[PDB]
Design a binder for this molecule. Structure first.
Ligand SMILES: [Cl-]
Length: 317
């Protein structure tokens, strides 16, 4: 009975995908909300997703309010995470609980990114208190965390996340096992299976596996050159291959698809993305590790073959 958590966020085609694929996922993170440094939950600038929430209630699909520490400029804010975890903790915890109640959410997904390394224990404590408060009301807690293994656990980007502590408090950790490479960096696998398995080994040693969700992207990246690239949605991969007549290579060691092409401006692009084999493989890791399930980022980027591959992999024993 694996959880199959879809992300409903600010992307074109989101609602069409939510409704088209509602037999494929069985929980949704409704990524429409921010929290302030005073602990108040707000909208994120996009229209309130009240239609999506109503749809999910009618389908009996659990919905989680996904709340981010994003400031008024649209930037991840270490300061907001610090404040919520310390001075505004009591307000934030109560407000998150009431927010879930008000919206008829089944729980909260805390998506706090750029947590400062100095806030490791503060953030763990916030999640402990929040988990107890949600549980006291029959609600659940999912915490989204960056994906890493021991070699990088002390990196400034990762040390704020104590998986052992977070996993003991939350119902699930949503391990963001994607963005292994990003446009700002050198080209490479975005969700390589070797890296993912290292990350999952690290997580399940520290957290009961049934409380872990892995993460599978419905996208890859297209680099013009290192540091210069853009997102390529799953649904657009085949058209791009066809536009340039590219011959894609399956990298078996990382279960990732790559290809190159020469653009009209003379640059040689490099794409790393997924195919059906790689998505099924990454979903099959739920059974290989005894995970609680998987998470897919995000609705609106995909087509029917993406969800067919997720289904196939989840059924692989
Ligand atoms: Cl980037």
């Amino acid at each position: 009975a694996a959880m199959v958590l879809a992300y409903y966020s600010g992307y074109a085609g989101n609602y069409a995908a939510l409704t088209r694929y509602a037999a494929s996922f069985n929980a949704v993170a409704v990524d429409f909300y921010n929290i302030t440094a005073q602990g108040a939950v707000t909208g994120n600038g996009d229209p309130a997703p009240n239609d999506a929430i109503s749809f999910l209630l009618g389908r009996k699909i659990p919905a989680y309010g996904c709340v981010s520490n994003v400031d008024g400029n649209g930037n991840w804010s270490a300061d907001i995470a610090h404040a919520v975890s310390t001075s505004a903790q009591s307000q934030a915890v109560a407000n998150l609980v009431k927010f879930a109640q008000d919206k008829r959410f089944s729980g909260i997904n805390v998506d706090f990114e750029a947590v400062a390394q100095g806030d490791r224990n503060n953030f763990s404590h916030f999640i402990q208190v929040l988990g107890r408060a949600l549980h006291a009301k029959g609600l659940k807690l999912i915490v989204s965390v960056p994906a890493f293994s021991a070699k990088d656990e002390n990196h400034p980007a990762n040390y704020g996340y104590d998986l052992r502590a977070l996993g003991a408090a939350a119902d699930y950790l949503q391990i963001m096992s994607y963005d292994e490479a990003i446009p700002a960096w050198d080209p490479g696998p975005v969700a390589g299976s070797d890296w993912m398995e290292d990350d999952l080994d690290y997580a399940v040693e520290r957290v009961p596996a049934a409380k872990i969700l892995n993460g599978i992207p419905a996208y890859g990246y297209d680099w013009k050159r290192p540091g210069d690239g853009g997102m390529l949605y799953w649904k657009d991969t085949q058209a791009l291959i066809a536009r340039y007549g590219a011959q894609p290579r399956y990298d078996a060691g990382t279960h990732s698809l790559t290809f190159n092409y020469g653009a009209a401006d003379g640059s040689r692009h490099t794409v790393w993305t997924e195919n059906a084999r790689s998505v099924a493989l990454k979903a099959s890791l739920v059974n290989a590790y005894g995970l609680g399930g998987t998470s897919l980022y995000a609705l609106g980027m995909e087509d029917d073959a993406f969800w067919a591959a997720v289904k196939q992999g989840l059924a692989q024993r």
